[PDB]
């Protein structure tokens, strides 16, 4: 639906969750896929193979729109970031450009309090 | 008296009515004891990031020997003139003329 070819696929592998989502060039979201909804709850949420299945979940149920050249703009320096990319290339897509527009602050706000 | 490299940019739509703006400011320098070294004009060059709507501003340079107290009030003029959005004054002792 809406007919889009260039699908901006924001893949955000944080630390223990990787979300893949193709949207419209404008901004109209198309379909999502997550390492937490496809299963793999655990240290598996922090694995690139789960990100490979995340790419597969973002490979089907999205052909209704039909994207070919997609702008895989990766966000958040996490576990995947390549296994997910080659999952999409082995899914039937042609990534026109892999961009690294990760959520980057100029050390704006303070970072969160976690891990020990 | 001191050297102030006043480099500023107006919008591409004001690039057609900026020469009048130039005669405004340079006339004030003559009325404030001053002399221009380089009225450097490149053209309307592409901005990296569009300012809230459009990119490609217009660059014009002065690089004038002028008194610090008049240029201070002159900077206030630039600050509340919405054509010139980004305008800064530079170091002293040496204002250049080459490289264009």
């Amino acid at each position: 639906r809406k007919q889009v070819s260039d699908g901006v696929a924001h893949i955000h592998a944080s630390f223990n969750n990787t979300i893949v989502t193709i949207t419209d060039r404008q901004g109209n979201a198309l379909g999502w896929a997550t390492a937490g909804g496809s299963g793999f709850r655990g240290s598996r949420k922090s694995t690139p193979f789960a990100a490979q299945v995340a790419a597969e979940r973002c490979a089907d149920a999205v052909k209704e729109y039909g994207i070919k050249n997609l702008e895989v703009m990766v966000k958040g320096p996490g576990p995947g970031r390549e296994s997910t990319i080659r999952a999409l290339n082995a899914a039937g897509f042609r990534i026109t450009n892999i961009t690294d527009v990760t959520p980057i602050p100029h050390n704006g706000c303070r970072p969160p309090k976690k891990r020990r | 008296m001191r050297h102030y490299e006043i480099v500023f940019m107006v919008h591409p739509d004001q690039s057609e009515q900026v020469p009048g703006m130039i005669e405004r400011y340079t006339a004030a320098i003559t009325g404030a004891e001053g002399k221009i070294h380089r009225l450097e004009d490149w053209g309307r060059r592409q901005l990296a990031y569009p300012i809230n709507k459009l990119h490609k501003a217009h660059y014009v340079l002065m690089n004038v020997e002028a008194p610090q107290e008049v240029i201070d009030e002159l900077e206030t003029t630039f600050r509340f003139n919405d054509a010139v959005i980004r305008s800064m004054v530079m170091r002293t002792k040496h204002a250049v003329t080459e490289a264009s």
Partner: protein
């Protein structure tokens, strides 16, 4: 080693930005001291020029916004 800070004595200007582009990358990043053999004098001079150019949109800050 470089021939920009040898034949380029006394403060490297930034009207024409092509020379700072030898010292920044196509991403918007500033080259480190250890690559091109350039003592801090020349290095920090470029630094002043760069900050100024990015405020005036001559040079970009990050890659994309």
């Amino acid at each position: 080693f470089c021939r920009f800070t040898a034949e380029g004595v006394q403060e490297i200007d930034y009207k024409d930005i092509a020379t700072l582009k030898n010292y920044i990358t196509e991403s918007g990043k500033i080259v480190p001291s250890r690559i091109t053999g350039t003592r801090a004098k020349y290095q920090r001079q470029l630094a002043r020029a760069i900050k100024r150019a990015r405020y005036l949109s001559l040079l970009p800050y990050t890659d994309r916004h």
